Amino acid sequence: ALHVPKAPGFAQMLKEGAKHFSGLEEAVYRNIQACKELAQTTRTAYGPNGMNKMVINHLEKLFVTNDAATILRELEVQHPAAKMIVMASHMQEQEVGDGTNFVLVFAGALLELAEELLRIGLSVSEVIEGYEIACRKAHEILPNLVCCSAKNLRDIDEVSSLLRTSIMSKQYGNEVFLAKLIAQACVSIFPDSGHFNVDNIRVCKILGSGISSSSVLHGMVFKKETEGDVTSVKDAKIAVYSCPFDGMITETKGTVLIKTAEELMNFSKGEENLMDAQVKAIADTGANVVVTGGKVADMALHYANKYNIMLVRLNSKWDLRRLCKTVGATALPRLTPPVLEEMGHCDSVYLSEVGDTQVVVFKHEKEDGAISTIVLRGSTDNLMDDIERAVDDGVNTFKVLTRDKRLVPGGGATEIELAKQITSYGETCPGLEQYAIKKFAEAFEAIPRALAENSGVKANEVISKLYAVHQEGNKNVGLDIEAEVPAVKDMLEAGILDTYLGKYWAIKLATNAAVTVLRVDQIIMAKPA
Amino acid sequence: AVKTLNPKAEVARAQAALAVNISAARGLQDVLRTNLGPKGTMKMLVSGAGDIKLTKDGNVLLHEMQIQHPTASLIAKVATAQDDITGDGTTSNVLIIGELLKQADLYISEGLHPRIITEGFEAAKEKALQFLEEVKVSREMDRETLIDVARTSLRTKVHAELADVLTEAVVDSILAIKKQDEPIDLFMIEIMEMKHKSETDTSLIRGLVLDHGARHPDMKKRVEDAYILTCNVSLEYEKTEVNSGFFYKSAEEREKLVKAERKFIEDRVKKIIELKRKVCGDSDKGFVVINQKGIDPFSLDALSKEGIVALRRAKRRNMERLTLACGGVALNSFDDLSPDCLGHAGLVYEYTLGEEKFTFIEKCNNPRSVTLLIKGPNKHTLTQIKDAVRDGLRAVKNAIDDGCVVPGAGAVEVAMAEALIKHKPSVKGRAQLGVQAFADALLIIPKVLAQNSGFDLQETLVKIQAEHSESGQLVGVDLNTGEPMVAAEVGVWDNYCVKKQLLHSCTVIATNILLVDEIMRAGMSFLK
Amino acid sequence: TPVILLKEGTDSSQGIPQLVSNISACQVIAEAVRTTLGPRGMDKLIVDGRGKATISNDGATILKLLDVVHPAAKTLVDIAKSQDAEVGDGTTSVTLLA
Amino acid sequence: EYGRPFLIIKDQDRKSRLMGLEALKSHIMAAKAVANTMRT
Ligand SMILES: Nc1ncnc2c1ncn2[C@@H]1O[C@H](COP(=O)(O)OP(=O)(O)O)[C@@H](O)[C@H]1O
Ligand SMILES: Nc1ncnc2c1ncn2[C@@H]1O[C@H](COP(=O)(O)OP(=O)(O)O)[C@@H](O)[C@H]1O
Ligand SMILES: [Mg+2]
Ligand SMILES: [Mg+2]
Ligand SMILES: [Mg+2]
């Protein structure tokens, strides 16, 4: 038989292993297919009824999770368009901290509809301009849907109710307990005239009993042991050092040079006397506990035991700073008797044991403090990891509420209203860009549908009833999860809400990613290495 | 001939070498022709590691496509040389080279020697340069003309909404760092990028942004009225150049030597503290130290106990920029420290972004150095914006450096072609044919533009040539109606040095390619 | 099909069959230690790669020495370890119960 | 749902097992052999 040799020009100068795709049929449609596959991968984990997923990475580590960002991080994607979608989702996670699945669902829907718009006859530029016009209109419409702005962010009973919705979709069936725990921990440290910093909430995981035995502590817990023979204090003055608890020496090489016998006899006694004087001078200021970030010498430990000083060491360079913030102490690079202003104060310091784990606890009787800790108890490491992820989501929700106080209804009410008003706007646009606009509105129906598909009901009836009830003027009506037959419910009365800022950023980033993917026309790929 | 000496050699003789060169040039232009104009399409490039790059630049596309050809290497080097001097015009270069070679081959395939076409090329080049010397427009170079030039050069890289944002920043920075002499010096405009807050937030700052902050927890995060000290003296532990060691007798001597080995740096820290106390008596103003060398935790502690913000290991070039912005003196020693050496800054503050820290110095009196702060949600977005910013800055600088600007959209090419057609009767011999070829090549710029807008090449070109023949106005293509338009009135402007350099380079490289007799690979296969 | 979504060699299973398979594997794990319960319980002997042997009646030890790699089955080992850590007795009743 | 061969134990295809009286009986045999070496 015969062969089709090659085409002259660029096809003959291309290296071996490289690829070149050009045109709509070889570039655009294949990208749309890849994005659709990526969206279908994570669609099933949306909402309170979304099911858990289990992933094993290339190092044989195990993840059991519902969060979309973690799932995308643990997978190994190869197609560039899916990489753009993943990067958009990660940017949304970094900017806000919740709503990394709305991005994927919306972008997939937008590209899926753009495929048929291109099939019918429209050009890519018109689709793009319609999408931008619709996005601007949606951002204009959104502020009018806001209801129930947050009133007081230092009231425990209101904060507990505001954070319940963000955790219900991760730990359905345990939302009240975790919500109350996170509310206490967050209300503890919010400072007046204060930026709320997220770092100041710490999580400690100890294997043991069920989740319901978890607790919150106003202070710190370290998984360490005491170096000395004193074990507890009842009123602690704390001195913190970043240098080793030992006799300090020259930076340049130094040798002890002796010429007579008497110096040889007296050297060790001189060193011991100096070390004793230093320890006694430190102790005379009233410090009961010394915390260091380096080595402790044997003689220094012996003299600390002589004068009843609790000695703890930890080597992280970051736990030391956080402890200094917790107790109000200032680190010292020298081994000198500290001044009163550099004293830390703690109500209790003690060594305890929880379920085979030995810990050292710095505990305050104060209600505010500077940082706080959450102690989690579970029967499996994966469960505690999932609970930690839920805690992070709740804390980020509190931070966003600090930034902006406005809430919008959830459960699909906002998306239905946006789609209705965008369709109404698009019916009055004369030109070819109206079709694109209408498609944009239809892309908002993928959010309620998914919910219904996860709840085990028929999405078409739910969407029809939502449209029918929104035609009458009820803007706060969404899907009812408890019912086994399709139904609708008032979300404002039932307290299902979500932040304005999250929805704003989600819409923006999803539209940006979809348009960026649509703009690419031809692809040149090097050979994988 | 060489085969009898080196059996492994590869050769291409007279009629085959020309075919190889022409084929490769056409292959390159067939790919690079889809970039020209604001209606060009965007390319995605993925390397072996898996990183993504979206681009439309000619130079980037040339240097990131997988190609192994000799004449392709020649053309890539020519494009790089053009880019490094002018910064704009790396696609038209390739297009014109390819079309010139194709037109020359059209006549060579009929039995004509290439030297005739070469002589025609030279004569046509001289005539075209003379014509371009009289088409140009000289102006005052006010802010509005520079706005037009920068916008024209920027709409071909990004969409309109972002171009309207980048134009103001580019023009404002170039005007801000300019003196009425002493030609414009870049490197006084620092490009910094932060990955957040979608790219419509790209901005210009009349100060500096430094990608590092204060390393002590007890330093103030915001300073309202600050003196700026800029130095490169070291506050780290330093040792003698000659070998040395300590020889003590007991513990007390060891302690004495330990405290003795720090005075050489404690003296410098005390000098700084004394100067700060002398100048900032009451605790109302601020004091900020920017150092190019390291600082110990001991020196950091000593400085922070007084209320000093200190940064270590700033980049070398900043040593100049701060001096031009804050207005002090960058000093290497502390033996003459006085209040003239200090600069002034009206706001100093810090911003934390994830794992990174940034420091903003703002509200200077008359800063001669400014910063372009890029923002966006991805990395390829920032890279593309950076390339666009480079193009715009080079365009504005070239506009100011010359006293003239040239109308665009293809008007000058049509004018040159029409002027060249009436010049060829004068010359003698077959060289006229070569002149003809040159003229046709100059029409590759309008044609492609029309073909990128969805029109037909020939009828639109005929419409364009219908004008400029009865009304001598410089007319070009209108990329949304296809009708002729007066380029100058609309606001489409092109640089003069770019066109001159482009003509010179294209003619030289095409002439040198057309005279190659045979291609040889007879040396050592590898240098091993 | 020209360019695939995930890396070659990624294995995926979903639906009722994978849940039924997980339930099936848990039965094998529970059967491993089933007959060591009560006043009339035997004990097991396990040999490792080097040749050393270990004879035990404690459920947590036996589950530890088995090189289980099934992701659904590792949970039963984890709960046995947790029970051993917390109370110290009853590390076989929990496995049979689950 | 076709419970096709699924992996539970590492190196499942090479490891062996003995359960019940047979295992017990094997032990006895070994012991007897050792004793019958020392009896003389
Ligand atoms: N009680 C509830 N009833 C119905 N829908 C809910 C309820 N609580 C939360 N949701 C919905 O869950 C959706 C998001 O869940 P989640 O899986 O966290 O997605 P994402 O991670 O993208 O926010 C929200 O759109 C919200 O409307
Ligand atoms: N608005 C416009 N209308 C018509 N032509 C334009 C317009 N903007 C730019 N051009 C033309 O585009 C050409 C430059 O295209 P560009 O893609 O920037 O590549 P390069 O500048 O590297 O050759 C110029 O010749 C200019 O005449
Ligand atoms: Mg969510
Ligand atoms: Mg350009
Ligand atoms: Mg028991």
Side-chain angles (χ1 to χ4, degrees), chain B residues 339-405:
Chain B
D340 191 68
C341 312
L342 303 173
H344 187 258
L347 180 66
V348 176
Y349 78 82
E350 185 194 79
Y351 182 38
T352 293
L353 180 80
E355 200 101 48
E356 221 168 10
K357 287 187 288 189
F358 301 87
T359 308
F360 294 75
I361 321 289
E362 294 173 352
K363 303 183 196 176
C364 308
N365 182 228
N366 267 358
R368 299 272 85 152
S369 191
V370 291
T371 299
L372 285 167
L373 196 61
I374 316 302
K375 300 203 178 197
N378 303 331
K379 185 180 282 182
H380 43 93
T381 298
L382 307 179
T383 296
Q384 188 189 122
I385 296 178
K386 213 199 293 283
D387 298 356
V389 144
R390 160 190 190 90
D391 275 24
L393 289 167
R394 294 306 188 288
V396 170
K397 179 193 180 303
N398 289 341
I400 283 170
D401 275 352
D402 296 303
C404 52
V405 75

Side-chain angles (χ1 to χ4, degrees), chain C residues 36-38 57-58 88-93:
Chain C
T36 35
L37 179 110
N57 181 268
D58 174 58
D89 190 36
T91 79
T92 65
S93 309

Side-chain angles (χ1 to χ4, degrees), chain A residues 251-253 255 257 271 526, chain B residues 46 237 246 248-249 254 261:
Chain A
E251 182 91 335
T252 313
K253 179 180 176 184
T255 65
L257 176 80
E271 273 194 338
Chain B
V46 167
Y237 174 85
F246 290 117
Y248 43 83
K249 206 55 73 80
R254 188 175 69 198
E261 74 168 340

Side-chain angles (χ1 to χ4, degrees), chain A residues 43 45-50 66-69 92 97-105 164-170 172 175 393 408-415 447-448 451 454 478-482 489 491 494-498 503 506:
Chain A
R43 176 193 220 68
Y46 192 92
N49 288 119
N66 176 345
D67 187 316
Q92 158 79 332
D98 194 14
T100 63
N101 215 344
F102 186 101
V103 165
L104 269 77
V105 169
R164 177 166 57 83
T165 312
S166 171
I167 297 142
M168 188 138 33
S169 65
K170 295 288 193 293
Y172 196 37
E175 62 266 16
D393 268 13
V408 302
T414 302
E415 290 83 330
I447 274 65
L451 287 170
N454 291 339
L479 166 68
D480 189 1
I481 282 290
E482 265 131 20
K489 201 164 115 171
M491 302 316 234
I496 289 108
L497 286 309
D498 36 359
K503 285 275 160 68

Side-chain angles (χ1 to χ4, degrees), chain B residues 308-337:
Chain B
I308 309 303
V309 177
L311 314 186
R312 53 192 195 192
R313 301 200 175 282
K315 49 168 72 173
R316 173 175 188 188
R317 193 158 305 277
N318 275 351
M319 269 325 113
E320 185 167 7
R321 281 181 194 128
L322 288 148
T323 318
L324 259 75
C326 310
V329 156
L331 46 89
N332 291 21
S333 170
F334 282 159
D335 288 313
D336 73 359
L337 216 52

Side-chain angles (χ1 to χ4, degrees), chain B residues 121-277:
Chain B
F121 281 179
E122 284 306 321
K125 187 192 77 180
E126 305 173 12
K127 183 61 176 178
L129 288 177
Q130 273 187 8
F131 194 77
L132 177 79
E133 205 54 37
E134 71 184 9
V135 187
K136 74 198 179 177
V137 199
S138 309
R139 284 147 82 83
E140 183 215 330
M141 291 316 138
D142 63 294
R143 173 185 209 269
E144 296 84 299
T145 304
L146 302 177
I147 284 276
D148 272 342
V149 177
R151 191 214 321 289
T152 301
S153 180
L154 284 178
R155 304 264 257 208
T156 71
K157 281 301 143 247
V158 296
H159 44 275
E161 183 190 1
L162 175 54
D164 302 334
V165 168
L166 293 180
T167 298
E168 308 281 333
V170 165
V171 173
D172 286 350
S173 54
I174 288 283
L175 282 185
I177 74 160
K178 169 178 200 301
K179 338 216 163 193
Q180 72 273 42
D181 205 324
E182 304 171 353
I184 313 296
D185 185 22
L186 314 173
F187 304 2
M188 296 300 104
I189 301 167
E190 180 64 25
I191 323 295
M192 200 81 36
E193 59 197 9
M194 310 168 72
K195 200 163 79 62
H196 57 112
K197 286 215 182 312
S198 84
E199 74 278 12
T200 51
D201 310 321
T202 308
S203 72
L204 170 78
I205 291 154
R206 316 270 181 159
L208 263 84
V209 188
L210 299 99
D211 50 339
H212 51 105
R215 290 271 166 186
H216 205 250
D218 296 327
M219 304 217 160
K220 290 184 284 191
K221 305 253 175 294
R222 192 204 184 79
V223 179
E224 187 65 33
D225 194 357
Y227 293 89
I228 308 296
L229 176 56
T230 312
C231 47
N232 87 8
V233 75
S234 180
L235 307 177
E236 274 188 341
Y237 174 85
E238 286 183 352
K239 63 179 177 62
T240 66
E241 177 66 22
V242 188
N243 300 316
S244 191
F246 290 117
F247 293 76
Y248 43 83
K249 206 55 73 80
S250 67
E252 290 85 2
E253 291 85 357
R254 188 175 69 198
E255 304 297 331
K256 290 180 194 160
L257 265 43
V258 163
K259 347 284 164 183
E261 74 168 340
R262 286 282 314 181
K263 302 294 187 187
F264 203 47
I265 312 309
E266 291 176 340
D267 286 324
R268 310 206 177 142
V269 177
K270 282 179 179 66
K271 290 208 191 96
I272 284 167
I273 287 168
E274 288 310 316
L275 176 65
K276 182 255 174 175
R277 278 201 204 118

